[PDB]
């Protein structure tokens, strides 16, 4: 362990995500993303069972809408 | 372990994702992504069973809509 | 282990993804992605069984719509 690491002894589920990025825009007189009409609808309506022993590390959907940098 | 690593002793599920990126735009008088009309609909409505012992590391959909850099 | 690596002792499922990218746009007076009308519909409505012991590392669909760099 030096920056974060699951270390279980029976079951280790994870969603390790180490997205180290760098973005260096420049230049002038430039439009980026004039109009955006977005309709994200991540409407989780799941269901479980009489013994469903889920062990999810991340139980959800990632919905992104960008113009330059989408690190997902 | 030095930057994050599942190390279970029975079962180790994971979604390791180490997307280290670099983006260097430049130039001038330039449009990027004028109009966007997006309709993401990641509507999870799953179902489980009477003994479904799921062990997902990441139970979700990634929906992206970018113009330059999509690191998924 | 130095940057993240499943090391189970019975079962190790994974979705290792190390997409290290570099993008260097340039030039001027240039359009990139004028109009986009996207309709992502990753509508997971699966189903499980009376003993379905799933062990997925990443149970989801990646839906991207970019113009320059799609590292999936």
Author numbering:
A (entry chain C), B (entry chain B), C (entry chain A): 82 to 153
What does the paper say about this structure?
Approximately 2–6% of ALS cases are caused by mutations in the antioxidant enzyme Cu, Zn-superoxide dismutase (SOD1). In contrast, wild-type-like mutants, such as A4V, D90A, G93A, D101G, and D101N, retain most of their physiological activities similar to those of wild-type SOD1. Here, we report the cryo-EM−determined atomic structures of homogeneous amyloid fibrils assembled in vitro from apo, reduced forms of the ALS-causing SOD1 mutants G93A and D101N. The AFM images, cryo-EM micrographs, and two-dimensional (2D) class average images using RELION3.1 revealed that both G93A and D101N self-assembled amyloid fibrils made of a single protofilament with a left-handed helical twist.
The subunits within the G93A protofilament and the D101N protofilament stacked along the fibril axis with helical rises of 4.88 Å and 4.82 Å and twists of −0.73° and −2.63°, respectively. The G93A fibril core features a very compact and serpentine fold containing four β-strands stabilized by two hydrophobic cavities, whereas the D101N fibril core features a less compact fold and displays a totally different serpentine fold containing four β-strands stabilized by a hydrophobic cavity. The hydrophobic side chains of Leu84, Val87, Ala89, Ala93, Ala95, Val97, and Ile99 are located in the interior of the G93A fibril to form the second hydrophobic cavity. Importantly, Asp96 and Arg143 form a salt bridge with a distance of 2.7 Å to stabilize the G93A fibril core, whereas Asp132 and Arg143 form a salt bridge with a distance of 2.9 Å to stabilize the D101N fibril core.
